């Protein structure tokens, strides 16, 4: 209800007033990083990781220990994505949508690595350090115990999302589709079928149990093949930092607490923006671009999360923006009627901006949907 | 790659402050 600054300040007090004295020593090499950090952190106690990080970069000349701290958290946040560990996959090309690999069991100790990552993420939040692993917003929603919605499906699996749109808005009794309350699952060539409800192996989906079947299938997509691994991550995280400490945050604020912010050069953002049904001179967009100028970079980067799904830009700027099909630039269009709000589609980096009446209307209704919707 | 994460600590700190 309150602002992000208050949520940040209150969370900093919890870590300050619950910190053990002295320091922990962690020594790593450039080439051993993942597996020195895995051994030493998983051999320490959860509460021990709460004492000052005294990182030893073997081979270097240790001076600035805050910078090696910022460095070690960033480099390790990218070393957990190594294909050799089979812990993570991507729902799209060019590293779009980072989600847990359901085939992580091919790593026999995988639950022990996920408990390790949970601790590593908790250490970053506890010590005010940032990561860049690239967890999706539904992943942060699970940490906040928020239930993933239908909108989140369009962010991680648009084709799965289009199937549920089609089911909801079509009388499937005319179109003639036998659907039951079941779902298959191929993990490592082993095909398994999950029952959505009690005895769903036998129950057709009709016009009546449809909206139910929709609440079920959505919840299955966010949990299938990842129940083990998610439990390991949260258990290791809760050991170091209690999960209740994040009760005030939302999924977009939690990403800010873990990834940080950049100043968003919109001389770049403006020139790398395409449109439907609009011109670069439509008084709508001439208003929109002037709104985003008066924004501070709090809400500027919140607009990025609302439209693109994350707060992190690619290294190439806004020209190398990637969607669920590959390179996809920032886009705005004429979608929605006058008494709507800005809705988005993160898989396309699209901002459905209805043609508003006045700048007063558009500065007012934009910031609300940016700050109160998803 | 320090400029990557360093720019993110600076922008974040200037907002809070
Ligand atoms: C991160 C980036 O690209 N730019 C940037 C802008 C400003 C600041 N510092 C303040 O705003 C106080 C840091 C980085």
Author numbering:
A (entry chain A): 492 to 865
B (entry chain B): 1 to 17
Passage from the reporting paper:
Here, we report a general and rapid method for discovering α-helically constrained (Helicon) polypeptides that cooperatively induce the interaction between two target proteins without relying on previously known binders or an intrinsic affinity between the proteins. We show that Helicons are capable of binding every major class of E3 ubiquitin ligases, which are of great biological and therapeutic interest but remain largely intractable to targeting by small molecules. In addition to possessing increased stability and membrane permeability, Helicons are capable of binding large, flat protein surfaces that are inaccessible to targeting by small molecules, and Helicons have been developed to target a range of PPI targets in cells and in vivo.
First, we focused on the NEDD4-like E3 ligases, which make up approximately a third of the HECT family. These include WWP1 and WWP2, which each consist of four tandem WW domains and a catalytic HECT domain at the C-terminus that transfers ubiquitin from a bound E2 first to itself and subsequently to the target substrate. These structures revealed three distinct Helicon binding sites on WWP2HECT. The WWP2 proteins in the co-structures with H301, H305, and H308 share a low root-mean-square deviation (RMSD = 0.5–0.8 Å) and are shown overlaid. Consistent with their ability to impact the catalytic activity of WWP2HECT, H301 binds near the E2 interface, while H305 and H308 may restrict the conformational change involved in activating this domain. While the WWP2 linker region is mostly helical, it is linear where it overlaps the H308-binding site.
